[PDB]
């Protein structure tokens, strides 16, 4: 890395994608699979449209993503 170029891709340099719930009483951010792109996702995406069953509901709290716990 460490240089001015578009499309940062390298070994161990993995990206991640996140999506915010469409409900204002949610506003929760769920993780997605690295094969998915935010330019092919719906304008009304919600927790019910998640890929991971551990967080596929609006009644499930947001994940601890702060480090390793």
């Amino acid at each position: 890395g460490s240089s001015g170029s578009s499309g940062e891709i390298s070994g161990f340099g993995q990206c991640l994608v996140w999506v915010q719930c469409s409900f204002p009483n949610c506003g929760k951010w769920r993780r997605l699979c690295g094969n998915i792109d935010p330019s092919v996702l719906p304008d009304n995406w919600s927790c019910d449209q998640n890929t991971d069953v551990q967080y596929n509901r609006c009644d499930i709290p947001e994940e601890t993503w702060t480090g390793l716990e």
Partner: peptide, 10 residues
């Protein structure tokens, strides 16, 4: 629906 990206870091 808002979207973002982050680095896999701590």
């Amino acid at each position: 629906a808002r979207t973002k990206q982050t680095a896999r870091k701590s």
